[PDB]
Amino acid sequence: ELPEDPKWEFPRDKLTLGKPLGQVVMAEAVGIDKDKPKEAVTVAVKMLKDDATEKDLSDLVSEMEMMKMIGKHKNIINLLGACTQDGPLYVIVEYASKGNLREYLRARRPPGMEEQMTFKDLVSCTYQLARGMEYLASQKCIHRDLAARNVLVTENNVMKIADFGLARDINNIDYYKKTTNGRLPVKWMAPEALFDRVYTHQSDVWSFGVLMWEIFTLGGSPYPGIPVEELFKLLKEGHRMDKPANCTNELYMMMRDCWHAVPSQRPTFKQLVEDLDRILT
Ligand SMILES: Oc1ccc(-c2ccc3c(-c4ccc(N5CC[NH2+]CC5)cc4)n[nH]c3c2)cc1
Numbered sequence: 155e156l157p158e159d160p161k162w163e164f165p166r167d168k169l170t171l172g173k174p175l176g177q178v179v180m181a182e183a184v185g186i187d188k189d190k191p192k193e194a195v196t197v198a199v200k201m202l203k204d205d206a207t208e209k210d211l212s213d214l215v216s217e218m219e220m221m222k223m224i225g226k227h228k229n230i231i232n233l234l235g236a237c238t239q240d241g242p243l244y245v246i247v248e249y250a251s252k253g254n255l256r257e258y259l260r261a262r263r264p265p266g267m268e269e270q271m272t273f274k275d276l277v278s279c280t281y282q283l284a285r286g287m288e289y290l291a292s293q294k295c296i297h298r299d300l301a302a303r304n305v306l307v308t309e310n311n312v313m314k315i316a317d318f319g320l321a322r323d324i325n326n327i328d329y330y331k332k333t334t335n336g337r338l339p340v341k342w343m344a345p346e347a348l349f350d351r352v353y354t355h356q357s358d359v360w361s362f363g364v365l366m367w368e369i370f371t372l373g374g375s376p377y378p379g380i381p382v383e384e385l386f387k388l389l390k391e392g393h394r395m396d397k398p399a400n401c402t403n404e405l406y407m408m409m410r411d412c413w414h415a416v417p418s419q420r421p422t423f424k425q426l427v428e429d430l431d432r433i434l435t
Pocket residue numbers: 175178197198200217231247248249250251252253254306316317318319
């Protein structure tokens with residue numbers, strides 16, 4: 155069924171599938187690193203469950219193809235290889251030993267809210283992620299699922315944009331389907347995505363604002379106490395989240411600018427990068 159692409163193809167005899175982290179498992183990939191071709195490199199492998207749908211398979215194939223076209227960056231989980239032939243589809247990606255940003259932040263919370271993090275650590279985290287999105291945007295990629303749970307942290311605390319399952323080319327949003335943007339978590343979605351069936355880089359900027367609010371609240375849930383059923387109405391009425399606890403007015407203004415009603419009046423990722431560098435220096 156799946157064509158050949160031997161630049162990306164990786165032998166199935168050299169992949170030992172370990173414990174779970176579709177389903178993702180810890181694996182050892184012997185010779186996946188070009189410069190050390192005998193050593194067992196720890197990677198992440200995404201595959202189908204036994205109860206998978208036709209959509210699950212085209213989603214996974216779509217995700218793989220997306221990660222080949224976007225290329226290489228410090229602040230995105232990078233495609234390492236793929237087993238496409240002669241058995242189950244395996245999509246092989248970088249292992250990030252400290253897991254998702256949400257649990258990473260919640261675990262480092264000071265006591266009494268129910269290694270700790272500095273203001274600068276939270277600004278640095280946001281800045282890493284803005285650089286990741288500046289690259290993705292420049293590669294014509296819209297992510298469509300920016301959230302803390304879809305950021306992974308490496309052993310060295312590097313922030314990696316993950317879960318390209320919903321990612322598209324900019325020119326591959328269907329204005330002429332009702333179902334377009336139907337599988338995006340609504341609490342992270344720009345209103346134009348919710349309503350008008352569009353999605354631009356400026357839709358991702360809105361999401362990145364929500365990610366910022368998650369970062370500065372140390373892994374808090376957006377619109378606390380507000381059901382997704384009521385959020386649609388509160389947004390068109392112009393509701394916006396209030397400032398996180400130890401967060402400066404400045405970074406709150408940044409979140410608020412990401413949540414402008416008009417997509418083209420929101421800042422670009424390039425502008426967020428410039429501004430976050432000045433605050434981090
Ligand atoms: O489409 C997808 C592509 C990649 C991944 C994915 C998910 C988890 C990981 C992980 C990962 C690494 C460590 C953890 N841990 C959390 C901390 N203790 C146990 C290890 C969890 C997840 N590394 N790389 C990944 C890629 C998920 C969906």
